[PDB]
Design a protein around this ligand. Structure first.
Ligand SMILES: *[C@@H]1O[C@H](CO)[C@@H](O[C@@H]2O[C@H](CO)[C@@H](O[C@@H]3O[C@H](CO[C@H]4O[C@H](CO)[C@@H](O)[C@H](O)[C@@H]4O)[C@@H](O)[C@H](O[C@H]4O[C@H](CO)[C@@H](O)[C@H](O)[C@@H]4O)[C@@H]3O)[C@H](O)[C@H]2NC(C)=O)[C@H](O)[C@H]1NC(C)=O
Ligand SMILES: *[C@@H]1O[C@H](CO)[C@@H](O[C@@H]2O[C@H](CO)[C@@H](O)[C@H](O)[C@H]2NC(C)=O)[C@H](O)[C@H]1NC(C)=O
Ligand SMILES: *[C@@H]1O[C@H](CO)[C@@H](O)[C@H](O)[C@H]1NC(C)=O
Ligand SMILES: *[C@@H]1O[C@H](CO)[C@@H](O)[C@H](O)[C@H]1NC(C)=O
Ligand SMILES: *[C@@H]1O[C@H](CO)[C@@H](O)[C@H](O)[C@H]1NC(C)=O
Lengths: 422, 101, 51
């Protein structure tokens, strides 16, 4: 085959650098073209266009512009209002639509042509729910930011109907991170076990309000629902005695996986700094790690299928693409040891519901792995620690003191009664 | 050539027609509740349905008039949590004990 | 006693958490009372339990 043009629909930074997801789509194409091992006799070419992320009329025009000159995939507009508009264009035309961001799958969607490389919150919400039972809680205070954050955690909210949690669901102020009238109420309610559902921009912002309030001490635990705690500056919070448990999927221990991250900070080399925000160096966050995977998982499916000659499809005179049904299964039964663990899709949907997580937590030496979640097994904690000998004492107890005692008149004799005596 | 669009009545279908009506200018009169995203910069539409941002005060006024302490909120689709979010945030201020199913 | 001149008084303030010492009567200057209180905030010691 030949050129095999892809397609990209990205954000509108408006006179700055290009976005984090756009370079990750342009760093992934440039890597596969120079490495002759993967995809030997092809040469991948990209087509990226710019939309406002909130306008489903611009996302529909810039999709049917890319469908006109010919693409073989559409790598996501990454927003709930405009991903659902480009999904149904990719359904009526045949071309796949690879997503790297969680949107609400409407229940009667009947869409075949999409896969989503973001870890689905039917599995993540069963991974917070096992950290609120490994830590043995009874009082949680789930905090979200926008009204979609109830859908992300709906298997965490349906939990007191099966267990003894007592949820106290709250909401951050509208967009402003001055959440002090929220956190004043959480001191007076004695709410120690907060389960923040922010992004990593707001988890750097609420924790500077939780330090100005007297709430970063050893009495407070904080489970985060961000897969970007490892790119979070925790230098002010390390000595407090706090507990900041969370997850990360990006394999920062593997050699081939970690080496791409310093190549990422080398090719970027500026990464526009904001030293009063509370975030570390760029580190290739999970929003941009998945777009580096999204080009490789499709690159597997074009390796196993050398028949693709990308044709010019219309948008007003729509016709299903010739190799649409055949090629979509090869994306959906693909497997790739990428940056974010193994990549396998749920063959009913096209949703990652089988994925390895790490259960990283805050200790006095930094922010370190303490375990490993796995949807088949569960929490395989590597708890097993020594830093201080056991907490109070062990149990020596009742023992019931059995007495050897025969029956004999009036010392020890049986009772006669009407009802049975046991 | 039209002068309005009368509201295709979904959450996925209405959002796609809304942004067409915004860019073209024609109004888009809705007759069903829709998850309106917090920063969809559109004002060329009216939504003639009683908003669950205000109607779920009325269920909250009704479950504290009857003085319930053991409510058991039951929805059917995952957009039901957005509809009743002003009722689910109520144990944080009152003494209800929800149990969502 | 604070460490000699360095205001990295964290091994002092770690001992004051484990001793349950809530009512400290610092005798610094105003240059060190601005400096020990940034170590008492990095430690979990600026809350309503401490005078
Ligand atoms: C994607 O594909 C997967 C499998 O390929 C489909 O399976 C769903 O996901 C899990 C996997 O089995 C199921 O959830 C598990 O249910 C166990 C018990 O729940 C039962 O309870 C009701 C009544 O209470 C029964 O009627 C019902 O049949 C359920 O089976 C729990 O014990 C499990 O918890 C343990 O596993 C999770 C992994 O998710 C870990 O966190 C822990 O190890 C935890 O101990 C778990 O909750 C789920 O029910 C399956 N079905 C559905 C419909 O979700 C998915 O269907 C598919 N995804 C889709 C279609 O979206
Ligand atoms: C939760 O926080 C506590 C501290 O409040 C952690 O316990 C300490 O762990 C460090 C490890 O370097 C050592 O100082 C001691 O082993 C512990 N100190 C005390 C006083 O117990 C604990 O590890 C955290 N747990 C999780 C899961 O994050
Ligand atoms: C090309 O990719 C392989 C894995 O597909 C990996 O070993 C490396 O990044 C490249 N190989 C060489 C020899 O450079
Ligand atoms: C090189 O291209 C030819 C097409 O002529 C193809 O058959 C072959 O598989 C390609 N090489 C590799 C290593 O895939
Ligand atoms: C958990 O991880 C350890 C670490 O090596 C491994 O040996 C073990 O098989 C894993 N699973 C269980 C169920 O313990």
């Amino acid at each position: 085959t030949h050129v095999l043009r892809f397609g990209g629909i990205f954000e509108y930074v408006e006179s700055g650098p290009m976005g984090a997801e756009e370079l990750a789509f342009r760093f992934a194409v440039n890597t596969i073209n120079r490495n002759r091992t993967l995809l030997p006799n092809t040469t991948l070419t990209y087509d990226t266009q710019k939309i406002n992320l909130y306008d489903s009329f611009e996302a529909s025009k810039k999709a049917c512009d890319q469908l006109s000159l010919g693409v073989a995939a559409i790598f996501g507009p990454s927003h709930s209002s405009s991903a659902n508009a480009v999904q149904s264009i990719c359904n009526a035309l045949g071309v796949p639509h690879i997503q790297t961001r969680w949107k609400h799958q409407v229940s009667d969607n009947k869409d075949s042509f999409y896969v989503s490389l973001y870890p689905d919150f039917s599995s993540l919400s069963r991974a917070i729910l096992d950290l609120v039972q490994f830590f043995k809680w009874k009082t949680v205070t789930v905090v979200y930011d926008d009204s979609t954050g109830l859908i992300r955690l709906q298997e965490l909210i349906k939990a007191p109907s099966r267990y003894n949690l007592r949820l106290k669901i709250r909401q951050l102020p509208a967009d402003t991170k001055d959440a002090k009238p929220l956190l004043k109420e959480m001191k007076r309610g004695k709410e120690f076990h907060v389960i923040f559902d922010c992004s990593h921009e707001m988890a750097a912002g609420i924790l500077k309000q939780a330090l100005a309030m007297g709430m970063m001490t050893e009495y407070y635990h904080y489970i985060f629902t961000t897969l970007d705690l490892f790119a979070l500056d925790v230098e002010p919070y390390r000595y407090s005695g706090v507990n900041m448990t969370g997850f990360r999927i990006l394999n920062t221990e593997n050699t081939q996986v970690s080496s791409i991250i310093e190549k990422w900070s080398m090719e970027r080399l500026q990464a526009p700094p904001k030293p009063d925000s509370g975030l570390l160096d760029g580190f290739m966050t999970t929003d941009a790690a998945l777009m580096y995977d999204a080009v490789h998982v499709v690159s597997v499916a074009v390796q196993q299928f050398p028949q693709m000659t990308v044709s010019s499809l219309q948008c007003n005179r729509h016709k299903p693409w010739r190799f649409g049904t055949r090629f979509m299964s090869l994306i959906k039964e693909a497997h790739w040891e990428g940056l974010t663990g193994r990549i396998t899709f749920n063959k009913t949907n096209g949703l990652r519901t089988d994925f390895d997580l790490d259960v990283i937590s805050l200790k006095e030496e930094g922010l370190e792995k303490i375990g490993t979640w796995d949807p088949a097994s569960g929490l395989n904690m590597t708890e097993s620690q020594k830093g201080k000998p056991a907490n109070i004492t062990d149990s020596l107890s009742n023992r019931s003191l059995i007495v050897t005692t025969i029956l004999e008149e009036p010392y020890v004799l049986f009772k006669k009664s009407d009802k049975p005596l046991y």
